[PDB]
Amino acid sequence: LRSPICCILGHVDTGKTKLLDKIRQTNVGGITQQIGATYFPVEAIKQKTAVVNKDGKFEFKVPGLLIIDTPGHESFSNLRSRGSSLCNIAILVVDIMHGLEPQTIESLRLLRERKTPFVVALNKIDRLYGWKKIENNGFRESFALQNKAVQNEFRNRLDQVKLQFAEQGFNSELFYENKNFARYVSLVPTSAHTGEGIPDMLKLIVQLCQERMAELQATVLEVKAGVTIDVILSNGILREGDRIVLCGLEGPIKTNIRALLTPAPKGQYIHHKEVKAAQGVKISAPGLEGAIAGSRLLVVGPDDDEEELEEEVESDLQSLFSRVEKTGKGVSVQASTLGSLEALLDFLKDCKIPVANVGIGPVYKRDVMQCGIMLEKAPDYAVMLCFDVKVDKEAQQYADENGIKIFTADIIYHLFDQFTKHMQEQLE
Ligand SMILES: Nc1nc2c(ncn2[C@@H]2O[C@H](COP(=O)(O)OP(=O)(O)O)[C@@H](O)[C@H]2O)c(=O)[nH]1
Ligand SMILES: [Mg+2]
């Protein structure tokens, strides 16, 4: 069998890094660091959840859990239709003391559109005034030992957070009060500081994956400059020397896996003849320049037709490139990954904003030039809406020289706001 994959999402300063760090802690099958991910064998999970499984009734049917730290939008890297190949389930981290934030809200909307199951970590409960910690305890067990004032503050903050979620269209319940997984999103109070609530969280993640979610699937999660690719192997086997095709900026990329690399526990990496799901692995291969984050990775077998596979891997990006106005009058859009780009196109289509040009990866002069033609065509739309992407300095300079506006945002809403402001300025 294989291990479910869990992605951890959160607003900055919400304690996701500290949380994953606390989840990693061990007395040591050992918890093992992998490329862009951390693997938890079922024994380690049993140990971390034992305190909330004292009777032993809970059955683990799973070999392990893979957890990917996904700060920002990497959990949404691939196209929506394949979301489960990247993340079976997610953990959304919210600071209980400040409640819902904008990045959190965007994360919520994106998780909902992609139909990605998630639970919420209501983190930093130790910040409750007078909280009496019991390290690594289950939340209920610790909560029972708190004074009246602490319980009161918890309930108040909880009701408030529940309201903020309700406004966003999500019905939420405290996890042990939660009765139906289909009806409510579970809120699990946690402390990255004390470890409290983490047993509950791991047990719940495992429970949901098993109860609800009981061919090769591999996704390019990151591209690192020679150029190597960090890949999440969700299903199947990858082997050294495998003939692979993936999505590239200027067309399909076809090459052969030179090396399968994981971090050394010495040299820097250890090589593998082969790796099996679920695994985060680094791939070394010639000609990986222009690889697209969020791209599928396909292996060309003996019966397979490499051309058809090239077409198939490029088809995601092409499906995005084709989503443009027939009129040819519209804005240019750009994003870092297939999923982010898809989200941007869907959002703008909802906003009835017309798009004439679609780009992926960091913004370069060619993208800005392409936008610049609109300036001759229809000047008002000679702008770029750029979602979570870097803008090359020369591209920005060229834009400023030629009166092309480049709008950038970490949140998709802001692109809309900025564009509306721009249009009102043009009509002003
Ligand atoms: N008291 C307390 N502090 C926390 C907790 N989780 C995170 N922090 C603090 O908040 C800061 C958040 O750090 P980090 O883990 O990088 O949060 P991130 O930016 O969302 O990844 C850290 O300096 C921690 O000291 C918690 O459960 N309790
Ligand atoms: Mg972080």
Coordinates of C-alpha atoms and ligand atoms in Angstrom, one line a residue:
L1 CA 0.0 0.0 0.0
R2 CA 1.0 3.7 0.0
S3 CA 1.1 6.6 2.4
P4 CA -1.3 9.5 2.3
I5 CA 0.2 12.9 1.6
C6 CA -0.6 15.8 3.8
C7 CA 0.2 19.4 3.0
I8 CA 0.7 22.1 5.6
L9 CA -0.6 25.6 4.7
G10 CA -0.6 28.9 6.7
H11 CA -0.3 32.6 6.7
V12 CA 3.2 33.8 7.6
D13 CA 3.9 34.0 11.4
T14 CA 1.0 31.6 12.1
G15 CA 3.5 29.0 13.5
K16 CA 3.4 26.4 10.7
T17 CA 7.2 26.1 10.7
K18 CA 7.3 25.7 14.5
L19 CA 4.4 23.3 14.2
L20 CA 6.0 21.0 11.7
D21 CA 9.2 21.2 13.7
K22 CA 7.3 20.0 16.8
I23 CA 5.6 17.3 14.8
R24 CA 9.1 16.1 13.7
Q25 CA 10.5 15.7 17.2
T26 CA 11.5 12.1 18.0
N27 CA 13.3 10.0 20.5
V28 CA 15.0 8.2 17.6
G29 CA 11.6 3.0 11.6
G30 CA 12.5 6.7 12.1
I31 CA 11.1 9.9 10.9
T32 CA 13.1 10.7 7.8
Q33 CA 13.9 13.9 6.0
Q34 CA 13.2 13.8 2.2
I35 CA 13.4 16.3 -0.6
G36 CA 10.8 18.9 0.2
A37 CA 9.0 16.6 2.6
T38 CA 9.1 14.6 5.8
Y39 CA 8.0 11.0 6.1
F40 CA 6.4 9.5 9.2
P41 CA 6.4 5.7 9.5
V42 CA 3.2 4.3 11.1
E43 CA 5.1 3.4 14.3
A44 CA 6.1 7.0 14.9
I45 CA 2.5 8.0 14.3
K46 CA 1.3 5.4 16.8
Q47 CA 3.7 6.8 19.3
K48 CA 2.7 10.4 18.8
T49 CA -1.0 9.6 19.0
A50 CA -0.8 7.0 21.8
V51 CA -2.0 9.5 24.4
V52 CA -5.3 9.9 22.6
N53 CA -5.5 6.2 21.7
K54 CA -5.0 4.7 25.2
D55 CA -7.6 1.9 24.8
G56 CA -6.1 1.0 21.5
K57 CA -9.4 0.7 19.6
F58 CA -8.2 2.9 16.7
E59 CA -6.9 0.8 13.9
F60 CA -4.0 2.1 11.7
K61 CA -4.4 0.7 8.2
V62 CA -1.7 2.9 6.8
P63 CA 2.0 2.3 6.3
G64 CA 2.9 6.0 7.0
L65 CA 2.2 9.6 6.4
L66 CA 4.1 12.0 4.1
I67 CA 4.0 15.7 5.1
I68 CA 5.0 18.5 2.8
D69 CA 5.7 21.9 4.1
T70 CA 3.8 24.2 1.7
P71 CA 4.3 27.9 2.6
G72 CA 2.5 30.1 0.1
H73 CA 0.8 28.3 -2.7
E74 CA 2.9 25.2 -3.5
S75 CA 0.0 23.0 -2.3
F76 CA -1.9 24.3 -5.4
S77 CA 1.0 23.8 -7.8
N78 CA -0.6 21.3 -10.2
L79 CA -3.9 21.6 -12.0
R80 CA -7.1 21.3 -10.0
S81 CA -8.2 18.1 -11.6
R82 CA -5.1 16.3 -10.3
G83 CA -5.0 17.9 -6.8
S84 CA -5.1 14.6 -4.9
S85 CA -1.9 13.5 -6.6
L86 CA -0.1 16.3 -4.8
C87 CA -2.2 16.5 -1.6
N88 CA -4.7 14.0 -0.2
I89 CA -5.4 16.3 2.7
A90 CA -4.2 19.6 4.1
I91 CA -3.6 21.3 7.4
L92 CA -4.5 25.0 7.5
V93 CA -2.7 26.7 10.4
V94 CA -4.6 29.6 12.0
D95 CA -3.3 31.7 15.0
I96 CA -6.1 31.4 17.6
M97 CA -5.1 34.7 19.1
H98 CA -5.6 36.8 16.0
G99 CA -8.0 34.7 14.0
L100 CA -8.5 34.7 10.3
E101 CA -6.1 36.7 8.1
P102 CA -6.2 37.5 4.3
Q103 CA -3.7 34.9 3.2
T104 CA -5.7 32.4 5.3
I105 CA -8.9 33.5 3.6
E106 CA -7.4 33.0 0.1
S107 CA -6.0 29.6 1.2
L108 CA -9.6 28.7 2.3
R109 CA -11.1 29.7 -1.1
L110 CA -8.4 27.9 -3.0
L111 CA -8.8 24.7 -0.9
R112 CA -12.6 24.9 -1.5
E113 CA -12.3 25.4 -5.3
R114 CA -9.9 22.4 -5.5
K115 CA -12.1 20.3 -3.2
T116 CA -9.1 19.6 -1.1
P117 CA -10.0 18.1 2.3
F118 CA -8.4 20.0 5.1
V119 CA -8.5 20.4 8.9
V120 CA -7.6 23.5 10.8
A121 CA -4.9 23.8 13.4
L122 CA -6.0 26.5 15.8
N123 CA -2.5 27.1 17.0
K124 CA -0.8 28.8 19.9
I125 CA -3.4 27.8 22.6
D126 CA -0.6 28.1 25.2
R127 CA -0.9 31.9 24.7
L128 CA -4.3 31.7 26.5
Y129 CA -3.8 33.6 29.7
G130 CA -3.1 31.2 32.5
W131 CA -2.8 28.1 30.3
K132 CA -1.4 25.2 32.3
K133 CA 0.6 23.1 29.8
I134 CA 1.1 19.3 29.8
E135 CA 3.7 18.7 27.1
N136 CA 2.5 16.7 24.1
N137 CA -0.9 15.9 25.6
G138 CA -4.1 15.5 23.7
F139 CA -6.1 18.7 23.7
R140 CA -9.2 17.5 25.6
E141 CA -7.1 15.9 28.3
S142 CA -5.2 19.2 28.9
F143 CA -8.3 21.4 28.5
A144 CA -10.0 19.4 31.3
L145 CA -7.2 20.5 33.7
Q146 CA -7.4 24.3 32.9
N147 CA -9.0 26.8 35.2
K148 CA -12.4 28.4 34.5
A149 CA -11.0 31.6 33.1
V150 CA -8.9 29.7 30.6
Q151 CA -11.8 27.6 29.4
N152 CA -13.8 30.8 29.1
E153 CA -11.2 32.6 27.0
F154 CA -10.8 29.5 24.8
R155 CA -14.6 29.3 24.2
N156 CA -14.8 33.0 23.3
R157 CA -11.9 32.8 20.9
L158 CA -13.3 29.7 19.4
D159 CA -16.8 31.2 18.8
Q160 CA -15.1 34.2 17.2
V161 CA -13.0 32.1 14.9
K162 CA -16.1 30.0 14.1
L163 CA -17.9 33.2 13.0
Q164 CA -15.0 34.3 10.8
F165 CA -15.1 30.9 9.1
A166 CA -18.9 31.1 8.7
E167 CA -18.5 34.4 6.9
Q168 CA -16.3 32.6 4.4
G169 CA -18.9 30.0 3.8
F170 CA -17.4 27.3 6.0
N171 CA -19.3 25.6 8.9
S172 CA -16.7 24.6 11.5
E173 CA -16.8 22.6 14.7
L174 CA -14.3 21.8 17.4
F175 CA -13.0 18.4 16.3
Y176 CA -14.4 16.2 19.1
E177 CA -17.7 18.1 18.9
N178 CA -17.6 17.6 15.1
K179 CA -20.0 14.8 14.3
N180 CA -20.1 14.7 10.5
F181 CA -17.0 15.2 8.3
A182 CA -19.1 16.0 5.3
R183 CA -20.9 18.8 7.1
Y184 CA -18.2 20.6 9.1
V185 CA -14.5 21.4 9.0
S186 CA -12.7 20.2 12.1
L187 CA -10.9 22.7 14.3
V188 CA -8.0 21.1 16.3
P189 CA -6.5 23.3 19.0
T190 CA -2.7 23.0 19.0
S191 CA 0.5 24.4 20.4
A192 CA 3.7 24.3 18.4
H193 CA 5.2 25.4 21.7
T194 CA 4.0 22.6 24.0
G195 CA 3.0 19.9 21.5
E196 CA -0.6 19.8 22.9
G197 CA -3.3 19.0 20.3
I198 CA -0.7 17.5 17.9
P199 CA -1.7 13.9 18.8
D200 CA -5.3 14.7 18.1
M201 CA -4.3 16.3 14.8
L202 CA -2.2 13.3 13.6
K203 CA -4.9 10.8 14.6
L204 CA -7.6 12.9 12.8
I205 CA -5.5 13.3 9.6
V206 CA -4.9 9.5 9.5
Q207 CA -8.6 8.8 10.3
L208 CA -9.9 11.0 7.5
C209 CA -7.5 9.7 5.0
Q210 CA -8.3 6.1 5.9
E211 CA -12.1 6.4 6.2
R212 CA -12.8 8.7 3.3
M213 CA -9.9 8.0 1.0
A214 CA -9.1 4.3 1.3
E215 CA -0.4 4.2 -12.9
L216 CA 2.4 6.6 -12.1
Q217 CA 1.6 9.8 -10.3
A218 CA 4.5 12.3 -9.9
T219 CA 4.6 16.1 -9.8
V220 CA 7.3 18.7 -10.2
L221 CA 7.1 20.7 -6.9
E222 CA 10.2 22.8 -7.4
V223 CA 12.8 23.7 -10.0
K224 CA 16.3 24.5 -8.7
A225 CA 19.3 25.8 -10.5
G226 CA 22.8 22.4 -12.9
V227 CA 19.0 22.6 -13.1
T228 CA 17.5 19.8 -11.0
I229 CA 13.8 19.2 -10.1
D230 CA 12.2 18.4 -6.8
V231 CA 9.4 15.9 -7.3
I232 CA 6.6 14.5 -5.2
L233 CA 6.2 10.8 -6.1
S234 CA 2.6 10.1 -5.2
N235 CA 2.1 6.8 -6.9
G236 CA 4.3 4.2 -8.7
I237 CA 8.0 3.7 -9.1
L238 CA 10.8 6.0 -10.5
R239 CA 14.1 4.5 -11.7
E240 CA 17.5 5.7 -12.5
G241 CA 17.8 6.1 -16.3
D242 CA 14.1 6.3 -16.8
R243 CA 13.0 8.2 -20.0
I244 CA 10.9 11.1 -18.7
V245 CA 8.8 13.9 -20.3
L246 CA 7.6 16.9 -18.5
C247 CA 6.1 20.4 -19.1
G248 CA 8.6 23.1 -20.2
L249 CA 8.4 26.8 -20.8
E250 CA 9.2 26.5 -24.5
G251 CA 7.7 23.1 -25.1
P252 CA 7.8 19.5 -23.8
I253 CA 11.1 18.4 -22.1
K254 CA 12.3 14.9 -22.8
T255 CA 15.3 13.5 -21.0
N256 CA 16.6 10.6 -18.8
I257 CA 16.9 10.5 -15.1
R258 CA 20.6 10.7 -14.4
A259 CA 20.2 10.4 -10.6
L260 CA 17.6 10.0 -7.9
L261 CA 18.8 12.0 -4.9
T262 CA 17.7 12.1 -1.3
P263 CA 19.5 14.0 1.5
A264 CA 22.4 12.2 3.2
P265 CA 22.1 11.3 6.9
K266 CA 29.5 11.9 4.2
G267 CA 28.5 13.2 0.8
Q268 CA 25.6 15.7 0.3
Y269 CA 23.1 13.3 -1.3
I270 CA 22.6 9.6 -1.5
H271 CA 21.8 8.1 -4.9
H272 CA 19.0 5.5 -5.5
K273 CA 18.6 2.9 -8.3
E274 CA 14.9 3.4 -7.7
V275 CA 12.4 5.1 -5.4
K276 CA 8.8 4.2 -4.5
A277 CA 5.7 6.2 -3.5
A278 CA 5.2 8.0 -1.3
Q279 CA 8.4 9.9 -1.7
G280 CA 9.9 13.4 -2.1
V281 CA 12.9 13.1 -4.3
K282 CA 15.5 15.2 -6.3
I283 CA 15.9 14.4 -10.0
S284 CA 19.2 15.2 -11.8
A285 CA 19.0 15.0 -15.6
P286 CA 20.4 16.9 -18.5
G287 CA 18.3 19.7 -20.2
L288 CA 15.8 20.4 -17.3
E289 CA 16.0 24.2 -18.2
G290 CA 12.5 25.7 -18.4
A291 CA 10.8 23.0 -16.4
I292 CA 7.3 24.1 -15.2
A293 CA 6.4 23.9 -11.5
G294 CA 3.2 21.9 -11.0
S295 CA 4.0 19.8 -14.0
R296 CA 3.2 16.1 -14.2
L297 CA 6.2 13.8 -14.8
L298 CA 5.6 10.9 -17.2
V299 CA 7.8 7.9 -17.9
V300 CA 8.1 6.7 -21.5
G301 CA 7.8 2.9 -21.4
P302 CA 8.7 0.5 -24.2
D303 CA 5.1 0.3 -25.6
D304 CA 4.5 4.0 -25.1
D305 CA 4.7 6.7 -27.9
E306 CA 7.0 9.5 -26.7
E307 CA 5.4 12.1 -28.9
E308 CA 1.9 11.5 -27.5
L309 CA 3.3 11.7 -24.0
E310 CA 5.0 15.0 -24.8
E311 CA 1.7 16.3 -26.1
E312 CA -0.1 15.0 -23.0
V313 CA 2.3 16.7 -20.5
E314 CA 2.3 19.9 -22.4
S315 CA -1.5 19.9 -22.7
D316 CA -2.1 21.3 -19.2
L317 CA -0.1 24.4 -20.0
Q318 CA -1.6 24.6 -23.4
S319 CA -5.1 24.4 -21.9
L320 CA -4.2 27.4 -19.9
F321 CA -2.6 29.3 -22.8
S322 CA -5.7 28.9 -24.9
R323 CA -8.0 30.5 -22.3
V324 CA -7.8 33.9 -24.0
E325 CA -10.2 36.4 -25.5
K326 CA -11.3 35.7 -29.1
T327 CA -11.4 39.5 -29.5
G328 CA -7.7 39.7 -28.7
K329 CA -8.4 42.6 -26.5
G330 CA -7.4 42.0 -22.9
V331 CA -4.8 42.0 -20.2
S332 CA -1.7 39.8 -19.8
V333 CA -1.6 37.4 -16.8
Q334 CA 1.3 35.5 -15.3
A335 CA 1.8 33.0 -12.4
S336 CA 4.5 30.7 -11.0
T337 CA 2.7 27.3 -11.3
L338 CA 0.1 25.6 -13.4
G339 CA -2.3 25.7 -10.5
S340 CA -1.7 29.3 -9.6
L341 CA -2.2 30.3 -13.2
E342 CA -5.4 28.2 -13.4
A343 CA -6.7 29.9 -10.3
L344 CA -5.9 33.4 -11.7
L345 CA -7.6 32.6 -15.0
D346 CA -10.7 31.3 -13.2
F347 CA -10.9 34.3 -10.8
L348 CA -10.5 36.8 -13.6
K349 CA -13.1 35.1 -15.7
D350 CA -15.5 35.4 -12.7
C351 CA -14.6 39.1 -12.5
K352 CA -15.4 39.3 -16.2
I353 CA -11.9 40.8 -16.8
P354 CA -10.8 39.9 -20.3
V355 CA -7.4 38.2 -20.8
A356 CA -5.4 38.4 -24.1
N357 CA -2.1 37.0 -23.0
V358 CA -1.1 34.2 -20.7
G359 CA 2.4 33.6 -19.3
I360 CA 4.0 31.3 -16.8
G361 CA 7.1 31.6 -14.6
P362 CA 9.0 34.9 -13.8
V363 CA 8.1 37.9 -16.0
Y364 CA 10.7 38.7 -18.7
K365 CA 10.9 41.3 -21.5
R366 CA 9.1 39.0 -24.0
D367 CA 6.1 38.9 -21.7
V368 CA 6.1 42.7 -21.3
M369 CA 6.5 43.1 -25.1
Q370 CA 3.6 40.8 -25.8
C371 CA 1.6 43.0 -23.4
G372 CA 3.0 46.1 -25.1
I373 CA 1.3 45.2 -28.4
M374 CA -2.0 45.7 -26.6
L375 CA -0.9 49.3 -26.1
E376 CA -1.1 49.8 -29.9
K377 CA -4.3 47.7 -29.9
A378 CA -6.2 48.8 -26.8
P379 CA -4.1 50.9 -24.3
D380 CA -6.3 50.5 -21.2
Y381 CA -5.7 46.7 -21.1
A382 CA -2.0 47.1 -21.6
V383 CA -1.3 45.9 -18.1
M384 CA -0.1 42.7 -16.5
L385 CA -1.7 40.9 -13.6
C386 CA 1.1 38.9 -12.0
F387 CA 0.2 36.4 -9.2
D388 CA 2.9 35.3 -6.8
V389 CA 5.7 35.7 -9.4
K390 CA 9.1 37.4 -9.6
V391 CA 9.5 40.3 -12.1
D392 CA 12.8 40.6 -13.9
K393 CA 14.5 44.0 -13.4
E394 CA 15.0 44.6 -17.1
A395 CA 11.4 43.6 -17.7
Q396 CA 10.2 46.2 -15.2
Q397 CA 12.5 48.8 -16.7
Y398 CA 11.3 48.1 -20.2
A399 CA 7.7 48.3 -18.8
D400 CA 8.3 51.7 -17.3
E401 CA 10.0 53.0 -20.4
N402 CA 7.0 52.0 -22.6
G403 CA 4.1 52.8 -20.3
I404 CA 3.2 49.2 -19.5
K405 CA 1.9 48.7 -15.9
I406 CA 2.9 45.6 -14.0
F407 CA 0.6 44.7 -11.1
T408 CA 1.9 42.1 -8.6
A409 CA 0.2 40.4 -5.7
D410 CA 0.6 37.6 -3.2
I411 CA -3.2 37.6 -3.0
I412 CA -5.4 37.2 -6.1
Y413 CA -8.0 39.7 -4.9
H414 CA -5.5 42.5 -4.9
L415 CA -4.9 42.1 -8.6
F416 CA -8.6 42.8 -9.2
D417 CA -8.5 45.8 -6.9
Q418 CA -5.5 47.2 -8.6
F419 CA -6.9 46.7 -12.0
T420 CA -10.2 48.4 -11.1
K421 CA -8.2 51.3 -9.7
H422 CA -6.3 51.4 -13.0
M423 CA -9.4 51.4 -15.2
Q424 CA -11.1 54.1 -13.0
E425 CA -7.9 56.1 -13.5
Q426 CA -8.1 55.7 -17.3
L427 CA -11.6 57.0 -17.2
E428 CA -10.8 59.6 -14.5
Ligands
LIG1 N1 3.7 30.5 22.4 C1 3.7 30.0 21.1 N2 4.4 30.5 20.1 C2 4.5 30.0 18.9 C3 3.6 28.8 18.6 N3 3.8 28.5 17.3 C4 4.7 29.4 16.8 N4 5.1 30.3 17.8 C5 6.0 31.5 17.6 O1 5.6 32.3 16.5 C6 6.7 32.5 15.6 C7 6.2 31.8 14.3 O2 7.3 31.2 13.7 P1 7.1 30.2 12.5 O3 7.1 28.7 12.9 O4 8.2 30.4 11.4 O5 5.7 30.6 11.9 P2 5.4 30.7 10.3 O6 6.0 32.0 9.8 O7 3.9 30.7 10.1 O8 6.0 29.5 9.6 C8 7.9 31.7 16.1 O9 8.9 32.7 16.5 C9 7.4 31.0 17.4 O10 8.3 31.4 18.5 C10 2.8 28.3 19.7 O11 2.1 27.2 19.6 N5 2.9 28.9 20.9
MG2 MG 6.9 29.1 7.1

